[PDB]
Design a protein around this ligand. Sequence first.
Ligand SMILES: [Zn+2]
Ligand SMILES: [Zn+2]
Length: 62
Amino acid sequence: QSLIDEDAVCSICMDGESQNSNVILFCDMCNLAVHQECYGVPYIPEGQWLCRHCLQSRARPA
Ligand SMILES: [Zn+2]
Ligand SMILES: [Zn+2]
């Protein structure tokens, strides 16, 4: 075994199933998990994911 889950469940649909059509992306700060299709994102980005609270947090200092 490796890990238990660490927020391995989507919030928009409460489904922790990482699939091609709906990949449950993990944040970078808070560690929120949500399918890129569930949140409303075109697809998987280059780096990680930053929720509106996440990006807004780091956006301050920049
Ligand atoms: Zn979802
Ligand atoms: Zn976040």
